Amino acid sequence: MLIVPYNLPLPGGVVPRMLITILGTVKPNANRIALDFQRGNDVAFHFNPRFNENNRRVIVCNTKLDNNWGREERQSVFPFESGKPFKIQVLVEPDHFKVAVNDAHLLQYNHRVKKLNEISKLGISGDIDLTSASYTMI
Template identity: 70%
Template sequence: MRVPFDLPLQTGLVPRFLITIVGTVNPNPSRFSLDFKKGHEVAFHFNPRFNEDNRQVIVCNSMIQNNWGKEERTAPRFPFEAGKPFKIHVLCETDHFKVAVNDAHLLQFNYRLKNLNEITKLSIAGDISLTSVTPAMI
């Protein structure tokens, strides 16, 4: 699957909607991102950065009316490695996104855009190759 990759979410998001993303981090990566979008707005930006000021960090944010909000950098660890496979689960809960990587909980991000059904696209970009992107209800 080519990156950048867009997954249309025809009916929008709902609680208990799960997206599983399987892929491999490229050699010598800089960053990659998952963006859950409502039109041009970004409801949830998940952005692992491999070398920001000589540190590895995961930045989460949203962009509403062309303005980025306050960055959240609270992930307790950085579970991605250059050249290694990964599996990301993003689960929509009633008031937040829950993210797990390689079957271990990583972080949650409270909804800033409240109308989940209006979030109709997942865009994936950056220094990864994708094996699969699978939506499901659980």
């Protein structure tokens, strides 16, 4: 019910206490999903489930500055399943983005991009049916 890739404007950027909620369903034969919190052409926070990286499922997080990817942060907890509905919650906290999937804490990602108020778009892409994408202040 939303078209992927989908752009969600974040007006005035992000700020601590801002909660972003993404609902959708992973496609049957999924390979990849990405959420990109963007500051212009930079990617402040890339959140990238890979369903088949050398026959392993991994989430890769990173930042893109001046077209260059930095040091990846990985982990092995992988809550997504092909064919199944998911909820991703991204809570902006003072020193990191905090991600929970299906109401279970997954990971945190320390802020590398410091101008939070310039992180003004969220891109959602890859092998999903996207139901909804929104934000609220908690």
